[PDB]
Design a protein around this ligand. Structure first.
Ligand SMILES: *[B@@]1([O])O[C][C]([C][O])O1
Length: 261
């Protein structure tokens, strides 16, 4: 299609490797570009950890209000919210919000601990039918994004399907799903990524990710005004370990997708 030609051209112009998956929930049609290639997830993995904790809260009804102590040893490389609560507590809800809306790495590590390790996050993915997602490490090392390394990767197609199930489907209970959507819609880190390629009238919930090798990711649910929602995953990584982030590539890929609708 035109869109796949334009995405290929965008990729060629960027010097990196671009993966895109769009699901249009109107007709369950899909647009894929490198849809079955593995990409480092970086912080887009935080959606799965938060959702796994939400799933636990369907049975442990008070779980999200459970206080979790933030100690100095807990702090890693990027903790905008956890830093504000060192030697205090945050609830699991506050930690989930921080992981998603500010990409707080300490918050993510607390969610992983709550789940019994990276294997507990991966188990949740398997439980909801995602056989591709794998979380192997904690923060910050899950962002190394080494070419060819399968650790901490998924594919665009898999992530789009899973994000659809978590936000628009019923992998989560009704209250949990609504909470996840509310958290994604309040993301603060996404203004230069998918959102920037879309009409300002559209409502977007997203989670960005960034890592080494110039890895620049964003996964989003999109509610166009008067139209069925869309799920869009854009993964991008580059050949140089110290490459700069390229959020503009994600914006451009979204714009190309939005043109084709
Ligand atoms: B994820 O990728 O988003 C931000 C943080 C910085 O390490 O991790």
């Amino acid at each position: 299609s035109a869109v796949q030609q334009k995405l290929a051209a965008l990729e060629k112009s960027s010097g990196g490797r671009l993966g895109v998956a769009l699901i249009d929930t109107a007709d369950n049609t899909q647009v894929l570009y490198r849809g079955d290639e593995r990409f480092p997830m970086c912080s887009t993995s935080k959606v799965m950890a938060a959702a796994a904790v939400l799933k636990q809260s369907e049975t442990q009804k008070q779980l999200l209000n459970q206080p979790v102590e933030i100690k100095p040893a807990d702090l890693v490389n990027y903790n905008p919210i956890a830093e504000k609560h060192v030697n205090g507590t945050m609830t699991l809800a506050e930690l989930s919000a921080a992981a998603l809306q500010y990409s707080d790495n300490t918050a993510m590590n607390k969610l992983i601990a709550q789940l019994g390790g990276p294997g507990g996050v991966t188990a949740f993915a398997r439980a909801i039918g995602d056989e591709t997602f794998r979380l192997d490490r904690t923060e910050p090392t899950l962002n190394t994004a080494i070419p060819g390394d399968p650790r901490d990767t998924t594919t665009p197609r898999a992530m789009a399907q899973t994000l659809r199930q978590l936000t628009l489907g019923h992998a989560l209970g009704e209250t949990q799903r609504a909470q996840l959507v509310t958290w994604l819609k309040g993301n603060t880190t996404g203004a230069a990524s998918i959102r920037a390629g879309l009409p300002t009238s559209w409502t977007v919930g997203d989670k960005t990710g960034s890592g080494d090798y110039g890895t620049t990711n964003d996964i989003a649910v999109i509610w166009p005004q008067g139209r069925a929602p869309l799920v869009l995953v854009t993964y991008f990584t580059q050949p140089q370990q110290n490459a700069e982030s390229r959020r503009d590539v994600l914006a451009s890929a979204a714009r190309i997708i939005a043109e084709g609708l």
